[PDB]
């Protein structure tokens, strides 16, 4: 079957590359009660060797929990929403923190080395391999397909992580930077601790290179590595190698790999009908603009009192699936970069930018109808800001021009949080007009807020950056303007006369 072939071929390949022998030679060098480490700078790569005292048997079971908000955790970047906490091996993490001092400068130097496009290797012995893995992980806090990333190589080390750490790196680009070498007779009780990274199980007949952690579990669940390296070299010149690992394990690996590949291409399939859903949303926006309400306030109204079934379909079927799809996209891409040149190679990035600038106002309406506050700093979900930042990163590299004499009737507003700010200003005006017994300094700080928002509206207007559909009569913006005009007294501003000289309908032409 294909999977066993790939495994055995990759095993023989990595053995023939020679990295194993050089790394084990350096380990033997440093070999003949604390962590000691050496560096070996060569012409082809840079190598590092760690080493730790003999493994404490019972003291190796305990773990030390970590948290995202905790600042004793050296890895704040790998933990995320669904996994804010992940425990680690206690002696390994202890010895890593103990020696963090000089390996900080070592990390600066190795980052410079990788910036110089020269390969980097970290390697480890029985227990120091765990420390080498931890150091590699700390080194991989900024991963891009284009940038050179390190590689850890380990011999005979027990496990370091639990199911949560395994879940953080199950398919990430960082699991592609670890290689463990375990003798097929080594048995690890994996009830609490779970393995990660690519494994290399060494038999006497030969080695096999596994990637699926379930297979590693069934194989290793339940030694001089120079000897097994020599036996690998001998098996390189042995005529016959038989089925080493059972066939049901191959069944499992093949099944999971096929599931993963089909799951991956499903989204490339789905994007095409997501574009059609967004076309439906375009039709809805056009119709809402016909009745001079605007799809923001019309969507808000219908979300308050569902009467039209067309809008019920718009909300329940189009928007929900757009959100689910793009959330899945952002969740999957940030762990496996696409195309190397950029995340969301080119169709996903631009389609997601348009999706954001078209659909985030609806989520803002739903957010502020629920009675929450301060969307921009507390409200927007992860994928929205991810799309915004990823489009901003490449928006500077591209050359573009914005003509002045154009129609803007279909211009999507770049600051997709415009309506959040409009609703916040509406809320502070409601306060300044309705609440009683309120302080005076708070009155002036709310006037600070109001004049700040007025300027923000003026800066986006004079920049030709806002859609003229905000100037609809039934729009929330014109209502807010009527309120602010009532409560302004007779203070005069260019925006205020702009709203008074009746040039806002000449805007966008």
């Amino acid at each position: 079957s294909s999977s066993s072939l790939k495994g055995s071929a990759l095993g023989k390949l990595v053995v023939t590359s020679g990295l194993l022998h050089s790394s084990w030679s350096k380990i033997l060098e440093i070999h003949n009660s604390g962590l000691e480490f050496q560096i070996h700078r060569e012409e082809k790569f840079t190598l590092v060797v760690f080493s730790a005292p003999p493994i404490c048997r019972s003291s190796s079971s305990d773990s030390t929990l970590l948290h995202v908000k905790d600042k004793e955790n050296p890895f704040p970047f790998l933990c995320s929403e669904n996994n804010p906490s992940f425990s680690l091996h206690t002696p390994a993490f202890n010895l890593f923190t103990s020696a963090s001092t000089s390996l900080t400068y070592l990390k600066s130097e190795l980052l410079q080395t990788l910036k110089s496009e020269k390969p980097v290797i970290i390697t480890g012995a029985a227990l120091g391999g765990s420390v080498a893995s931890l150091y590699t992980l700390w080194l991989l806090e900024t991963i891009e397909p284009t940038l050179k990333r390190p590689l850890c190589i380990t011999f005979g080390s027990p496990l370091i992580g639990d199911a949560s750490l395994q879940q953080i790196l199950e398919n990430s680009v960082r699991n592609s930077c670890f290689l463990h070498v375990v003798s097929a007779q080594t048995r690890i009780k994996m009830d609490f601790f779970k393995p990660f990274g690519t494994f290399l199980i060494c038999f006497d007949s030969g080695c096999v290179c596994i990637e699926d952690h379930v297979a590693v579990t069934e194989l290793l669940n339940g030694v001089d590595y120079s000897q097994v390296l020599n036996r690998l070299d001998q098996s390189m010149l042995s005529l016959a190698d038989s089925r080493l690992i059972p066939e049901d394990v191959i069944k499992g690996i093949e099944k999971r790999a096929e599931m993963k590949n089909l799951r991956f291409d499903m989204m490339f399939k789905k994007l095409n009908d997501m574009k059609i859903s967004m076309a439906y949303i375009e039709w809805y926006k056009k119709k809402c603009k016909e009745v001079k309400i605007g799809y923001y306030d019309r969507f808000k109204t219908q979300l308050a009192f569902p009467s039209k079934e067309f809008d019920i379909n718009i909300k329940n079927h189009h928007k929900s699936e757009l959100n689910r799809f793009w959330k899945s996209v952002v969740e999957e891409v940030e762990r496996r970069p696409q195309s190397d040149a950029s995340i969301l190679k080119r169709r996903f990035l631009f389609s997601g930018n348009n999706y954001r600038r078209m659909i985030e106002p609806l989520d803002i309406a739903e957010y502020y109808l629920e009675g929450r506050k301060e969307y921009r700093t507390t409200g927007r979900s992860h994928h929205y800001v991810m799309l915004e930042k990823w489009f901003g990163m490449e928006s500077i590299l591209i050359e573009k021009e914005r003509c002045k004499k154009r129609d803007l009737s279909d211009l999507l507003t770049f600051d997709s949080c415009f309506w959040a700010e409009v609703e916040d200003s509406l809320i502070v005006i409601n306060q300044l007009n309705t609440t009683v017994g309120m302080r005076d300094d708070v009155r002036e700080v709310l006037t600070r807020k109001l004049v700040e928002f007025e300027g923000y509206v003026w800066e986006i207007i004079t920049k030709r950056e806002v859609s003229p559909e905000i100037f609809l009569e039934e729009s929330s913006f014109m209502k807010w303007w009527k309120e602010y005009k009532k409560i302004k007294g007779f203070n005069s501003s260019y925006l205020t006369e702009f709203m008074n000289t009746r040039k806002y309908e000449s805007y966008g032409k």
């Binding site: 790939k6 590359s17 592609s176 005529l239 016959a240 574009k275 573009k400 154009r406």
Partner: protein
């Protein structure tokens, strides 16, 4: 059986062998005439200067072909030119120069309508391959006939080209002309699969040991053993890495490793006829050939580890016995017989090597299955009627309104525009699905080659690309990500345009007229003078080609016409298309 598959009989094999042996004494090539056949044999040069060029800096002595001299040797869509060994290439253009009288000979030979055969021993074989390519590019592609069908017959030649080379050969349907005999232990097929540094030490001794003429050199045990060893180690690593890249699986672990490895780009090109003391085994699958190049030469047991290397060198001079005893051997095409386990053991293949060859064959079968599925999809009624509804219903009714489809789409005030947009979306979806498979190459090499894949794509482009131009400039995407031609234009349309251009030739684009006229309008004439002039110059050529249609483009409501009205009196008065 043999002649049916390969297209050459034993007589031509024997004559090419004799002419190759004759070519040793002459200078750089020997011209032989046997009635209707004219055989150009090429002189092998066993000097190490003639395998790795000295002025070349790369680790394999490889260079990109000039796109003007070898235009058809590249990926048509992507645009990547193929890679050839610079030593043999310099040999080829050294012989080609007008002073050598090779070109006049071959052209008078084609005037006499003779079957031209290019042949040679080890490095003469590589020179023959390159000369066959040059001939196919200069003569066969201009006026193709069976009278011009060349043949290349090589004995123990080394690899000459990379994967793009073999792909361009398989696409133009030229890989059937080449035949390359390889005895079960010849080392010259395997040499160029190793790094320059891996064999740069023991290469002169072994190349002197390989020259048939001067047997004055005497064999050295350790030089031969060491050279064969590393040659086989580099071969084994390249073979295993080709196995791991089979389905694209475990690629990321390979990518970490690939940053730590140099691997030979050269790949088998053409038919390879392995030969033993009992069998002839023809293979046409490049990856299967590559796996057999390693697993056939493996030792039967460790005791033979002493005998294998020396025999290797000896087997480079067994082609005489091969050609003489050709008829008495058993022949069987490997790619076609559905039971190859017995043949592989007869060839000298272990169990796992047999499974790797099996996997390469299965992957070829899956490629042709994918082509079958794509052909089934693109021929269905719904896709064809989607393509049709734009020509029969959208464009005519938009011509009736005296505006045109491109404008009707841009303003988008009808249900017709919404249906046009959804149809365009789904069409682009299926074309992007197939585009990726071609980029993946999970498709047989002939796919870009097939005319039907070409007519469909160019019709789809000509119909639908203006729709996308209108979608791009309709929602002010122009003002967001730049001009359409730079970053907006999809890949599928570029693939289609390049495929069509290559097929027919063997603001620069046709269907990009709207893109240009967008940037043209709204600027003073003193800066768009030359662009307007170039556009209106090509306009007629697209109208002759068909890309653009005057009906639509010249209506009163059309944007281009309303813009052209605004031009300077002098320009419109002296314009070529004034009468419109």
């Amino acid at each position: 059986a043999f002649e049916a598959l390969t297209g050459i009989n034993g007589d031509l094999i024997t004559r090419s062998w004799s002419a190759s042996k004759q070519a040793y004494l002459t200078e750089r090539y020997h011209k032989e005439e046997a009635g209707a056949v004219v055989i150009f044999a090429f002189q092998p040069s066993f000097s190490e200067k003639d395998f790795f060029d000295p002025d070349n800096k790369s680790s394999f002595g490889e260079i990109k072909l000039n796109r003007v001299q070898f235009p058809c040797m590249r990926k048509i869509g992507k645009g990547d030119v193929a890679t050839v060994n610079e030593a043999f290439l310099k040999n080829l253009e050294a012989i080609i120069d007008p002073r050598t009288s090779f070109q006049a000979s071959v052209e008078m030979a084609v005037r006499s309508r003779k079957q031209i055969v290019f042949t040679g021993h080890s490095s003469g074989g590589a020179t023959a391959i390159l000369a066959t390519v040059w001939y196919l590019e200069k003569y066969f592609i201009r006026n193709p006939n069976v009278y011009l069908e060349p043949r290349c017959v090589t004995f123990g030649a080394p690899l000459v080209g990379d994967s793009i080379f073999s792909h361009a050969l398989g696409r133009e349907k030229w890989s059937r002309f080449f035949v390359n005999f390889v005895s079960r232990f010849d080392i010259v097929p395997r040499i160029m699969l190793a790094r320059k540094a891996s064999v740069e030490e023991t290469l002169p001794h072994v190349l002197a040991q390989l020259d048939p003429r001067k047997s004055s050199v005497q064999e050295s045990e350790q030089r031969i053993t060491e050279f064969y060893t590393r040659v086989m180690r580099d071969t084994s690593t390249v073979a295993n890495q080709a196995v791991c890249e089979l389905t694209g699986s475990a690629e990321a672990f390979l990518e970490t490793l690939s940053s730590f490895l140099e691997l030979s780009p050269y790949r088998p090109a053409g038919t390879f006829v392995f030969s033993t003391e009992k069998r002839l085994v023809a293979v046409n699958n490049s990856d299967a050939i590559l796996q057999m190049l390693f697993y056939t030469s493996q030792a039967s047991d460790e005791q033979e580890w002493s005998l294998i290397p020396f025999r290797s060198i000896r087997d480079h001079h067994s082609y005489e016995e091969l050609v003489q005893s050709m008829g008495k051997k058993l022949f069987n095409h490997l790619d076609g017989e559905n039971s190859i386990e017995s043949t592989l053991n007869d060839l000298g293949v272990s169990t796992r090597g047999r499974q790797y060859v099996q996997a390469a064959l299965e992957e070829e079968k899956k490629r042709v299955e994918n082509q079958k599925k794509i052909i089934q999809v693109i021929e269905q009624e719904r896709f064809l009627k989607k393509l049709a509804w734009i020509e029969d219903e959208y464009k005519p009714k938009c011509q009736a309104h005296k505006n045109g489809y491109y404008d009707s789409f841009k303003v988008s005030n009808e249900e017709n525009d919404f249906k046009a947009n959804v149809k365009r979306a789904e069409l682009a979806g299926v074309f992007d699905e197939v585009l990726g498979l071609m980029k993946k190459c999970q498709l047989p090499d002939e796919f870009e080659g097939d005319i039907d894949w070409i007519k469909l794509a160019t019709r789809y482009r000509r119909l639908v690309e203006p729709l996308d131009i209108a979608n791009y400039h309709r929602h002010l995407k122009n003002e967001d990500t730049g001009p359409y031609m730079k970053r907006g234009r999809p890949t599928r349309y570029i693939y289609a345009q390049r495929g069509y251009e290559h097929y027919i030739l063997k603001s620069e684009c046709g269907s990009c007229f709207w893109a240009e006229v967008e940037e043209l309008k709204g600027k003073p004439y003193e800066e768009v003078e030359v662009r307007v002039k170039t556009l209106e110059g090509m306009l007629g050529e697209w109208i002759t080609d068909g890309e653009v249609d005057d009906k639509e483009i010249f209506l009163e409501g059309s944007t281009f016409r309303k813009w052209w009205i605004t031009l300077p009196k002098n320009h419109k008065s002296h314009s070529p298309l004034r009468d419109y």
